[PDB]
Design a protein around this ligand. Structure first.
Ligand SMILES: O=Cc1ccc(O)cc1
Ligand SMILES: O=Cc1ccc(O)cc1
Ligand SMILES: O=Cc1ccc(O)cc1
Ligand SMILES: O=Cc1ccc(O)cc1
Ligand SMILES: O=Cc1ccc(O)cc1
Ligand SMILES: O=Cc1ccc(O)cc1
Ligand SMILES: [Ca+2]
Ligand SMILES: [Ca+2]
Ligand SMILES: [Zn+2]
Ligand SMILES: [Zn+2]
Ligand SMILES: [Zn+2]
Ligand SMILES: [Zn+2]
Ligand SMILES: [Zn+2]
Ligand SMILES: [Zn+2]
Lengths: 253, 253, 253, 253, 253, 253
């Protein structure tokens, strides 16, 4: 078997990928999302009740479908990154990255020694399909994609430095965390926040990196796509479930 | 503690209750549905991948909310009915009921000896809150609600006989199973099927029983409500999730 | 490896075994019970929310401890008996047995062909420790113990016939189900019920079978032990947990 | 989406399919087996500790790989067959089939009304991918494969009658159950048993049905393949795990 | 929906709240405890085998009952605090707090930016009921209660400094950890330890903070209540289960 | 009850113990391994998808068998070490230990105050069997065994310093991590790596500590045993399962 090709990673340079957030934290719900045709599915280990084992179940569900899996760990924790790579997550989204030094450590966390610090345990791992991918230890590093979130004042204060880190494939903007950091908690739609987001997207793309963002607002998402933003998540499974059930009830009250 | 009052059962005689089908088979998804404000939630043990333990988890989630839980077992199995009553399901929907003799057996399955055949194990049961409902064995039978599905030719052939069974609180019409039985599989919207459904609702209500049905078609559901149908399910969580995610993607293709 | 010796089965002829009911339905709770020193633990698949997989977990927990495991299935279902024997349950308690013909079928359900109807799948089974017990198919039948419950009027109406069935090792009296059947639901302590229980114990022992019962009433349990009842359950984990937490709170209200 | 094509079913007429028994009862273990390249994987719901939900997890794991999944339910139970079809099992292996009447009922259990009795609940089902397979109710019956086990004297006594049932795609011989039924429990390798198995394979193929069997004996499996047996399972995951770990320890004692 | 009111937090200034430790690590056991009527239930993520997902299940069980849930994470880990707040834990008990600097960080960990560092992910969170609490991001901080444990020499060495931290609602004394730190491991009942505990309770209350403690000793618990201690846990579910089962067996040996 | 004797720890001074790696992450798979007769089983929390709760399940399975359990946490995390000790893991293997200061902290992490920093919560813990081991807090430290991995250049750079730490019972060499660190990723068999491993084994034993290693290569494992290496793992369950299923299929292709 050849290593699973990371089409998400390749498509960062060739197209604009439409994403769905997966916070239902469940192999069965993840399979439903995987049937829709999103370019990418974000398995949220930061803000949904997930652990390594529930994320594994969702990777197994999604694996039968073309949608590419991206996993967000709860934090930039090196041992947790090791665990998520070994269950076979090929793209990671690291929250709250705030310096070039932290971004460099996240690069190393995703690459084998001697160049990186990814723990070596291929025989045991779904990532190597238990060494059924015979040359995994030689071919792994190439299909791993590292995305980092800029979503605080300190992140924006270190944006140019992070954008200079070789091995950061993409910078994703978190409007909820960023709007709160800016003192507009719950109000990312404000011009003050939006002008900072647009400028940030322009700088990311000017430095030759992929830009990404989430917005459930159709108009904002289409604006970000018009700016050339490479990976745009356009909705959240929990939000779509709740809103669809509320809209239906409202027809009958 | 006094036994949990079955408001679903009481409301069969005082109002028209709006229902949501719950097939996501998960305590977390069931809690999301429970926040919307449906009069009743159908935990589907027949067509969703549920067992006694997953149904228990969903009852625990839903219990903090006003929405009344109704459980559909996979079949009219007496021992399975015993298990679902003991985890505390107070309303059951029995699929594919086809005779007065079967309906009478389902009545007995929901009531303690000496009048019924419900196995006695109160001490162990969430139903008695582990005997924290001190008079459970005396007050249980009153808050249990039995609904039976008529959804085959043999069911329609025994409709008058089933409607004469004391202890059947409601007859629910299954348009998917009924349309297939009638040789209109996938096409319940056909006038042939709909005239049989309308006549069936009229007969159920004429015999003094509650009538129920599921339709995701807003126009049909409102027609059934105009006829006086007591319990109408108007949508399905899996369908709402899938359709909402597809409609969103279609805005970006 | 030699087959696990069923010490419960042997001790039916040599001593009076003290039992604890396990309805917490959980490997961790079952292990707590296993540390106490009960002769036998009843893993309740009839009145606690258990399935084959949760019963397996509890058998695995208990297996490190001297306490002997007895499993109650939800009903005398032949395929479910097959499943519980293959996960390695060596003693089964069948509820609501009401005829010699049903007791004979339960005997056959526990024994391999050609003499019985137990499905043969030893290679796959914890029962054979995956053929690590090399002679399992020749030695299995001997360590299997069949107990049947008499707990209805029809059971009492067929008591002499059931007591004549070769392969029934024990008859257990269910006071909750029996008192309800007799029209004393919730009141097994009444003289009418107790005289029937004592007479039933005497008849069981007179026919050379082991007699069993559950009572959380210390005086009744000690009375049953004085009559020579071979297997007496003296409490229930859910009941002891609830009562101990209530008694503690009452000291502080 | 078009309905998933049942390549197992088509290949019953075009080649000899090599199978692996999956009794480890776990999505992660099922995925390991799925990487090997077996034509088919038997998810054992009869002799491994599986339920609908654990079988679902294994179907989800296996679905990303070419290996075709076959599910054995604990018995020919119509409602359980309904559940296993709805989670998306397209091939079923029914144990202990003993008459034309039982085989006909298993045929109906796998087909929608009006011709069959399969319960209609497509909207909710992984089988329809929650109606993402738009014409599922018209195209389902064609990709369902029914296999029945002949593995008792009564099965052999009704072999010609079972072989005349339209809708039975395959007859599988169970050497463990059959050798026990014949009074050679644990000794299927005996000439008495083997001549009956060979004769049975010849009769199955002469009636135009697919023949199947399990043997972990390489010589017996190759003999069955030389006779033209269409679906041959050649090993069991639990057995291969135990034997490989024992053989390794023996090198070091 | 308005944000769930934290009655535990309000009652810290109006009454003395009686608590039960919940270490059975299970939604079903947590529900049993929730029926008793304790003012508060401590879901132990430090010394019972719990993770985010098992703590979620227990919050869901408890949510239907008046008992207020308090969650102890394994350590003062900022990302784990984020996870436990998002599943809807409104009161946290942080173990082994040893400085004003660590207590200040725990305050920030529980509050949204710009004043705190709680990660913003309301849409996804049971805490917001998936934005069904429409103003959650404005009303969340007010219903969050922060308790910190002083249970080491360094904690006692920094007691006055911790008691001056705005945002610490309560200091809880850990007699097991504290007695071990003092070189009286397993002997918290010693006068040396008890005089330090009493002095510590007096200092906590004199600084205007709530004092808390656990003791399964009825006399010690009543002494702590007489001193005015605001939140007193009086027992542990695992201990009450084990002791009740041992005391029962001892009546029969 | 007296504390469980750690026979693994005692046998480090009396014999050479043969080990099996357990990465199938499952109580049922762990029990299969437990039946084989390995001296020790490594429950891998670093490179298999395990958490505290799945490791607990595997400890419960294994506990009925003579095989000694060793648990590898994901990293030398003090709170996670506390959790694994409380579920009753008596031997820990800490990955990627690189200094005397880190080894000393791991020693303290495994011992109660006042000498160590192990959090005290015995009442709640399977480790004390919920205080059924009445003197657990006095007898625990003696049956705890600490192993550390040297598997990086920094580890080898601090080998003499680590070997001087009182309370390190064993140093385990990780050939996958070490060969990668040395720029021979995937090629530990090279003479450059092997000479370093042999020298390292000699230095460990010369300092009076137990030496350990894993090799699935029978010749290398036997060479390590001839050098007197005290704890040698000779295979991995995932590897043996995959290889045995592949070898079987190759006989039939
Ligand atoms: O610990 C990591 C590891 C690496 C390769 C193996 O074969 C087994 C374990
Ligand atoms: O088996 C049912 C049962 C009833 C009451 C109890 O207390 C225990 C068990
Ligand atoms: O189907 C049961 C069975 C029996 C023996 C085996 O080796 C495998 C399966
Ligand atoms: O009960 C089955 C069912 C069928 C179709 C639906 O849309 C919902 C439920
Ligand atoms: O990542 C956090 C998040 C916040 C709000 C959303 O709607 C979705 C995700
Ligand atoms: O927090 C730990 C703890 C210690 C002893 C107990 O009895 C209960 C909890
Ligand atoms: Ca978990
Ligand atoms: Ca289950
Ligand atoms: Zn964010
Ligand atoms: Zn139907
Ligand atoms: Zn009973
Ligand atoms: Zn068979
Ligand atoms: Zn403490
Ligand atoms: Zn390593």
């Amino acid at each position: 078997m050849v290593n699973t090709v990371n089409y998400f990673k390749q498509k960062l340079k060739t197209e604009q990928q439409i994403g769905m957030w997966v916070g239902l934290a469940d192999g069965y719900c993840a399979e439903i999302a995987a049937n829709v045709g999103y370019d990418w599915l974000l398995i949220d280990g930061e803000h949904a009740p997930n652990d390594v084992r529930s994320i594994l179940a969702q990777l197994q569900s999604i694996a039968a479908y073309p949608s590419q899996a991206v996993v967000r760990p709860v934090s930039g924790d090196v041992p947790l990154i090791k665990q998520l790579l070994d269950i076979g997550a090929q793209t990671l989204l690291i929250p709250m990255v705030e310096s070039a030094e932290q971004a460099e450590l996240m690069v190393k966390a995703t690459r084998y020694p001697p160049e990186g610090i990814r723990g070596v345990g291929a025989a045991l791992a779904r990532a190597s399909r238990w060494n059924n991918i015979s040359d995994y230890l030689q071919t792994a590093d190439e299909q791993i994609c590292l995305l980092v979130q800029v979503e605080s004042k300190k992140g924006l204060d270190n944006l140019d430095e992070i954008l200079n880190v070789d091995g950061v494939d993409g910078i994703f903007i978190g409007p909820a965390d960023l709007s709160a950091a800016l003192g507009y908690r719950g109000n990312p739609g404000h011009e003050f926040v939006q002008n900072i987001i647009v400028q940030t997207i322009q700088k990311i793309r000017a430095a030759g990196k992929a830009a990404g963002i989430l917005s459930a607002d159709e108009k904002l998402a289409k604006q970000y796509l018009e700016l050339g933003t490479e990976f745009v998540a356009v909705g959240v499974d929990t939000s779509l479930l709740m809103k669809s059930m509320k809209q239906l009830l409202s027809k009958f009250k």
